[PDB]
Amino acid sequence: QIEQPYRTGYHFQPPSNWMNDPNGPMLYQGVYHFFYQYNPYAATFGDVIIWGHAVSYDLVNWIHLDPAIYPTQEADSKSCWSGSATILPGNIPAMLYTGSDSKSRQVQDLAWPKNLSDPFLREWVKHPKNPLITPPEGVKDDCFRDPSTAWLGPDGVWRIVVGGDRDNNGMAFLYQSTDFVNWKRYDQPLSSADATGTWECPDFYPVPLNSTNGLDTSVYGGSVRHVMKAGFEGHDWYTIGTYSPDRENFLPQNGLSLTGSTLDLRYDYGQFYASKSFFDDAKNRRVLWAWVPETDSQADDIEKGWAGLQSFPRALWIDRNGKQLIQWPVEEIEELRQNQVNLQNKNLKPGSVLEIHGIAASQADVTISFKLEGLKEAEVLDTTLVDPQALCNERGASSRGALGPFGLLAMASKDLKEQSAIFFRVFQNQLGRYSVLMCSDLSRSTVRSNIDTTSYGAFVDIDPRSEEISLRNLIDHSIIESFGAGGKTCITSRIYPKFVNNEEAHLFVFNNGTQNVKISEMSAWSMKNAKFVVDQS
Numbered sequence: 001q002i003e004q005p006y007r008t009g010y011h012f013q014p015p016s017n018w019m020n021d022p023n024g025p026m027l028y029q030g031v032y033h034f035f036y037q038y039n040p041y042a043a044t045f046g047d048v049i050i051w052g053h054a055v056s057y058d059l060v061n062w063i064h065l066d067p068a069i070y071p072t073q074e075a076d077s078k079s080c081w082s083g084s085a086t087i088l089p090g091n092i093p094a095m096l097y098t099g100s101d102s103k104s105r106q107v108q109d110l111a112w113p114k115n116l117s118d119p120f121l122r123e124w125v126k127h128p129k130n131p132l133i134t135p136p137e138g139v140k141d142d143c144f145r146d147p148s149t150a151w152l153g154p155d156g157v158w159r160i161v162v163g164g165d166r167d168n169n170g171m172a173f174l175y176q177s178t179d180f181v182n183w184k185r186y187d188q189p190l191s192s193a194d195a196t197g198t199w200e201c202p203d204f205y206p207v208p209l210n211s212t213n214g215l216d217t218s219v220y221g222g223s224v225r226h227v228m229k230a231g232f233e234g235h236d237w238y239t240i241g242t243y244s245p246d247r248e249n250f251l252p253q254n255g256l257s258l259t260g261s262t263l264d265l266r267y268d269y270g271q272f273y274a275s276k277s278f279f280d281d282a283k284n285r286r287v288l289w290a291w292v293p294e295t296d297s298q299a300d301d302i303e304k305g306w307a308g309l310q311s312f313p314r315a316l317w318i319d320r321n322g323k324q325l326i327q328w329p330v331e332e333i334e335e336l337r338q339n340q341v342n343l344q345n346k347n348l349k350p351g352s353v354l355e356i357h358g359i360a361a362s363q364a365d366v367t368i369s370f371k372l373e374g375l376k377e378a379e380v381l382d383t384t385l386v387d388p389q390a391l392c393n394e395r396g397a398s399s400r401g402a403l404g405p406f407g408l409l410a411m412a413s414k415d416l417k418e419q420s421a422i423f424f425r426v427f428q429n430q431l432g433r434y435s436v437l438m439c440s441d442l443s444r445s446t447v448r449s450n451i452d453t454t455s456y457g458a459f460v461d462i463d464p465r466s467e468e469i470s471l472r473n474l475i476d477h478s479i480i481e482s483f484g485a486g487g488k489t490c491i492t493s494r495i496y497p498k499f500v501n502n503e504e505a506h507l508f509v510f511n512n513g514t515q516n517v518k519i520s521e522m523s524a525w526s527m528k529n530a531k532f533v534v535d536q537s
């Protein structure tokens with residue numbers, strides 16, 4: 001019998017109970033601050049949600065503090081929902097969040113540290129005038145929330161967006177202010193989309209072209225593009241475009257309005273929601289946090305006493321081609337690497353399974369690169385309108401193709417009765433052009449009942465002819481984060497195999513295709529636990 005086999009060893013999560021949306025992340029005076037929607041009374045959502053608070057010097061090891069923002073005014077008497085942090089000139093962290101007032105209205109409130117000499121910013125004070133912003137004209141009281149981090153225009157005016165919808169039409173309501181206290185709604189929203197429902201936790205920020213670095217939220221220029229991110233219809237979507245502060249106009253590069261279809265981009269194609277980023281000026285990088293929901297049952301959560309994880313902080317930047325974003329675990333995670341097991345120039349015959357020995361299979365960092373043999377043998381399949389998730393669910397690791405499925409078997413039991421398969425497939429259209437599919441087959445991840453074992457998939461934008469297909473996996477008990485092609489395609493999975501209660505997990509490399517594939521390089525590292533120190537009461 002193993003105690004709490006589903007808790008992670010290096011992912012952020014509270015000592016116990018329910019946690020969802022990441023809030024107000026930021027770097028202040030050398031300290032990384034992290035906040036999050038928290039229910040201090042149960043392992044499920046509840047009537048009283050507050051901001052949990054933790055600090056870190058490296059984004060890996062944390063110190064849990066007492067909740068920072070909780071009901072104290074009429075403006076947030078019923079709950080303190082999502083918000084963002086903006087460090088104003090003069091070095092004051094300003095927090096804008098959505099509060100549920102005494103009349104159950106979603107309103108935007110302001111708060112800031114009450115003791116800037118405290119490196120951990122434990123105590124916060126609320127602005128006497130809260131709420132600072134209330135639902136506009138024709139917007140429902142429960143469809144106006146999640147203010148973003150603000151950006152200061154060259155005209156000295158601050159901007160922020162607040163999510164919501166007007167008649168089921170997603171909205172990124174734009175507000176302006178010079179003193180950060182008196183805000184005025186701009187005539188038109190920054191962006192929007194028909195019939196998408198409320199836009200949750202919108203994020204708007206710039207990314208430097210031809211650079212793998214991040215930018216302060218207030219930078220603008222021709223060598224900069226902006227990202228409009230919004231959560232709706234159950235997923236986080238984003239679109240790259242150009243921002244004209246003068247006209248408060250956001251023009252999507254592909255000219256499309258978000259539709260929540262295979263036409264739009266996502267940060268992650270698995271369990272990933274309410275993602276929020278912040279700029280780290282110490283390392284000139286933009287860091288992204290995201291809530292990773294549970295996929296087990298509510299009864300399971302109540303029984304184990306907790307629910308919700310945060311994805312591991314990832315650096316974020318725009319690809320050299322300028323058409324999509326790239327994500328990668330922040331370098332500080334590399335410090336958790338212990339012993340290493342490596343493989344090179346290893347052939348994987350059709351229908352073969354190769355076990356990787358010597359690694360702590362439940363807590364590891366695994367990278368593998370495949371060198372393909374005979375691309376022309378790729379199954380012919382035009383994927384212009386194909387839904388990659390549907391395809392992955394239809395063709396799991398047991399569905400044998402020509403090129404694919406080949407990849408990893410993670411959180412697998414000795415006998416393989418339970419396994420999580422992260423793999424690729426290679427296809428070609430009629431004109432000989434290749435496409436690459438990345439799948440997270442969770443269909444056999446557990447023999448347990450009442451577990452959402454839906455699989456996830458996405459197409460990887462690489463040319464198999466000149467690029468080996470690479471895959472990195474962050475394995476941490478009940479969560480697996482997969483990065484294909486250096487972060488071009490990310491998929492986060494939650495799995496709950498039964499075997500982990502009394503036996504060790506295993507790790508395998510496999511190839512169930514009819515074509516041979518070669519492992520050119522494979523690096524696996526056992527990952528030690530991140531430190532979580534409690535400093536409360």
Ligand SMILES: *[C@@H]1O[C@H](CO)[C@@H](O[C@@H]2O[C@H](CO)[C@@H](O[C@H]3O[C@H](CO)[C@@H](O)[C@H](O)[C@@H]3O)[C@H](O)[C@H]2NC(C)=O)[C@H](O)[C@H]1NC(C)=O
Binds near residue numbers: 400510
């Ligand atoms: C690689 O592809 C194999 C061929 O599809 C796949 O086979 C597994 O074993 C047999 C076929 O050899 C099949 O299992 C069937 O029988 C069991 C009874 O124990 C049923 O419960 C299953 O539903 C199924 O009818 C399957 O095709 C497959 N087994 C399972 C669990 O589906 C291998 O498993 C594939 N290898 C990898 C690593 O995925």
Ligand SMILES: *[C@@H]1O[C@H](CO)[C@@H](O[C@@H]2O[C@H](CO)[C@@H](O)[C@H](O)[C@H]2NC(C)=O)[C@H](O)[C@H]1NC(C)=O
Binds near residue numbers: 115117118119
């Ligand atoms: C504001 O923050 C400072 C810095 O943490 C607090 O000062 C510490 O207070 C504890 C308990 O009183 C002492 O043991 C430490 O030695 C103090 N350190 C410093 C830097 O002076 C201070 O108490 C906080 N102010 C309030 C009102 O709580």
Ligand SMILES: OC[C@H]1O[C@@](CO)(O[C@H]2O[C@H](CO)[C@@H](O)[C@H](O)[C@H]2O)[C@@H](O)[C@@H]1O
Binds near residue numbers: 021037
């Ligand atoms: O915890 C509140 C936080 O949750 C989000 C997650 O997307 O929205 C959920 O909670 C709201 C308040 O109860 C609901 O109105 C909303 O429908 C639900 O999805 C965030 O939007 C919000 O800040």
